[PDB]
Amino acid sequence: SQANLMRLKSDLYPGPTKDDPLTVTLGFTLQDIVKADSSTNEVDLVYWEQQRWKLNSLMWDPNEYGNITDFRTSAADIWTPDITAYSSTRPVQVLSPQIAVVTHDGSVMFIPAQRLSFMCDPTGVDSEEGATCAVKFGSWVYSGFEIDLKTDTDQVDLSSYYASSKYEILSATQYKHDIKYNCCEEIYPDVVLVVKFRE
Amino acid sequence: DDDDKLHSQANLMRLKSDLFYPGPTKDDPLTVTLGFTLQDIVKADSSTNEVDLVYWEQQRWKLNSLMWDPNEYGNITDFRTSAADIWTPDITAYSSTRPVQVLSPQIAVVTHDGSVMFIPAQRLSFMCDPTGVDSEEGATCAVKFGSWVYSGFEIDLKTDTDQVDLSSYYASSKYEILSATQYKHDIKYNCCEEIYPDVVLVVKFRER
Amino acid sequence: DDKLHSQANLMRLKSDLFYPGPTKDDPLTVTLGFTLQDIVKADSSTNEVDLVYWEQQRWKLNSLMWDPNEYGNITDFRTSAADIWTPDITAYSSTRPVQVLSPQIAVVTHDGSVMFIPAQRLSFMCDPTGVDSEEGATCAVKFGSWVYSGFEIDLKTDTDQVDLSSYYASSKYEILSATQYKHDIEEIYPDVVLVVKFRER
Amino acid sequence: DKLHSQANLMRLKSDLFYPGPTKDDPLTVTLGFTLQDIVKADSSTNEVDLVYWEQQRWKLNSLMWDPNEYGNITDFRTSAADIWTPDITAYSSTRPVQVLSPQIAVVTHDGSVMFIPAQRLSFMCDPTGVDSEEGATCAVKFGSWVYSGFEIDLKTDTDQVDLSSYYASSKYEILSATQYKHDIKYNCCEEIYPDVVLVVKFRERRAGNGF
Amino acid sequence: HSQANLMRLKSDLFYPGPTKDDPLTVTLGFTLQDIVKADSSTNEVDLVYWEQQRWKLNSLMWDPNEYGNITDFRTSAADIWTPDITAYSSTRPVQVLSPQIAVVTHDGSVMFIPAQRLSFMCDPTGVDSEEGATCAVKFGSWVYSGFEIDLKTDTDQVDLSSYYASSKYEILSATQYKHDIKYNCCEEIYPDVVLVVKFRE
């Protein structure tokens, strides 16, 4: 079995293009609003960012490789999408191992846990209505012609939100948007995390 | 005796050469045993609900690919090597708020039965409300550790004891430990069909 | 299978393509432009201000040109900025190493032009005295090559005005003006100076 | 003359360029401390921050050469990544140690290696009494992380911490600094475990004659 | 052709460091840009400066006529040997602010000028007075004695022409002295450049 897996990895990409486009499914699990800094208007979130895509170049017949259906690999061994927060104020801090799971249908699952500081005015967090902040996520360099974005849900997963956080969540959504600018033909997709929260 | 030193060096260089794994799978699963030694609660931040711990995390597992016959290598029964030279499990704190900081050399002990012992010392900031730390009852917080990417079918996560080792806890810490346990749990996450085991550190502590 | 032939055509283009840097005999022009997104922090105890901006860099190399007809009508591609030469554009009065906020990926076009737009957070030398007033404070930071003179790298801009169309509307600081004039100082030394006037919102 | 020396060194390094010690091939590592500053004592977390230079010396037969075969070269400098180095560690640090000096060692023709990293360390210390005439006392143990005294035999040249470079205008005055060597034995196991413990007694410079 | 000549030069060119019988002279000088912060709770002061370093290697020499008149080039500092110049009383690792690129000239000389931010041991008592505070920090090789690295200055006057005019701290004087210490047992001398700065709020 080990030899079959090693042989699979040895047998097993310049990224997508207009002629070979890719869809990335994105979802957030929001774990904690750690800090809300009203002297700089930065808020700090901890979340898990679920990323999934599929490549034909990663497919294999399991019967040809000892009935292996999936395996774990360094995210450095594979191409990964350049999904970026568009209004961060510090480099994102990676909180989980940089490992992805590849399946024989060519699909890749990668779920980095991250701490993010982003631009957010927390005025109102000390009130019943709370504060509201938003941050857009998408590719930094690819348009909708190379990378399209999808979600499995428009509701952020709050099932792991820390119940004794300094801040409680009033709502958290991850709506996808496809923006067409008047100037260009390409669509520009994003997924926007919108969080309403209070002390 | 200078020659003897030369021969044991040669035998070790040859063993390491001969030995130097793709990770576990449903069909080649791995048991990883975890144990914690809590050394210090450094800081409790009630403005962000983050607590900072220093601990040693004992990890051990066994690989057939790391076994050897000592009689073929000058009766070498174990050796030390950089953790970079070997596969290591992706044991992760599930509720950290900053990347974990490693305090010790990343070096493992490999024994001729293929067992590996790796014990990194770490400083961890994790989600924890310290309300009550200034009382006789104290505060109580938990943090889960487990593989980030391997389900229970690939890595089986065990302990040797339900008790966190406090015998090296810093006696002049700002915080005294009232109790510390490390029980196992099996959890279904929304991403994935398969169950993931963890070891959950539960710590009750108060200002000294 | 068309998708598969485009992948192979791109792999072949990148192999075919993969420059010692400019010289006095082979000089390079780098176009710079700034998009200011946020004034995060102004520290009056140290006279350091913190900016987040996107720095657009463009240049063109003959060694990166290709014929699209020979590579499947491929007119451009994305590639890691480590695969290519990049200019050593530096803030001249930073007080902390610049922090990169965006993937280090450039777009190369068939005519040999390159576009690279790193988002950055920068602390730089700036006295915010007067930021708590209607007139606000004014600060400046120069950007340019660290090691090349004007003989090897000349700098251009496409505009004298900093792009504020993405400036954070609920920042602690509002922008009164932001300009990016080019300045020249045996060899000439060019820079692009970011001058910002700002005040507490 | 310079060129022949440079050639001879390139040839020596190529000729020369160890799996670490074992019970059958133990290594003596000599340790010493030069304490340069107590920077900060934090009574809200019981952490104290030190700057020191940690001298490490050991000797390998595999690094020996005859100076006569290499143009009389008797010493050279090399990246400490180019060689094995011992896994000497503070046993009660609270942050990763920060290395302040270049990671370069000096190798001598008898096979001896000298490596002296300057370091900033945060470690567990209750500074109670630092604002009094008697001062505070902290201690931090240094030793191998994974090797017993039967693999790494830890020694010192002196029990005295070198204070000759202690910063004269530090916020903290040093009352004493020792580096005594200790051995610990477990009934289970035949191996003895050595450490060198840095013990520092210090006070706020304004606490001396404080009234 | 110019590019081919440069790529040939660098391929022809691409040092184990000095020894007693192959000593190297390193010339050092400082451009002081800012005193950012003076922390009287820990007696640490934070400087931003540019550290000019120059040395010469016979193994980096070439004939400009054999290489198309090329007289110098830029190269990553990781491509060449560089001296281990270190502050002797830093309290945090130095932070590099500029690209790590050096200029190599056909005579074998190398010029390398890193911009750095340095926290060092310094009591700022008196900085709030007319007389100011005075602090000093030594710079030199960590691991080489004067038998291997001979340290020199071109001048003892610290370059203040780029000092930030709205710093929280004004410079009363800055001097870089070529200093050494010798232990009577032994022939080796241990040189340094002592940077002495007198400053005030």
Ligand SMILES: CN[C@@H](C)C/C=C/c1cncc(Oc2ccccc2)c1
């Ligand atoms: C214990 N970790 C949870 C808290 C969150 C993450 C799970 C995970 C992360 N990265 C890849 C991924 O991928 C898989 C693909 C196929 C089958 C199973 C998992 C799973």
Ligand SMILES: CN[C@@H](C)C/C=C/c1cncc(Oc2ccccc2)c1
């Ligand atoms: C959605 N993107 C923003 C938040 C800004 C950053 C854009 C960018 C950065 N680097 C290259 C570049 O290049 C492209 C060329 C053509 C089409 C799209 C982008 C684009």
Ligand SMILES: CN[C@@H](C)C/C=C/c1cncc(Oc2ccccc2)c1
């Ligand atoms: C534009 N940056 C300045 C404000 C400060 C630094 C200049 C510099 C840094 N590193 C090498 C060096 O070398 C060269 C040699 C000859 C001509 C030009 C520069 C120059």
Ligand SMILES: CN[C@@H](C)C/C=C/c1cncc(Oc2ccccc2)c1
């Ligand atoms: C000028 N440096 C002091 C402030 C501290 C460090 C010295 C040092 C560090 N690493 C090796 C060592 O080794 C050498 C052996 C012989 C002669 C010179 C040094 C010396």
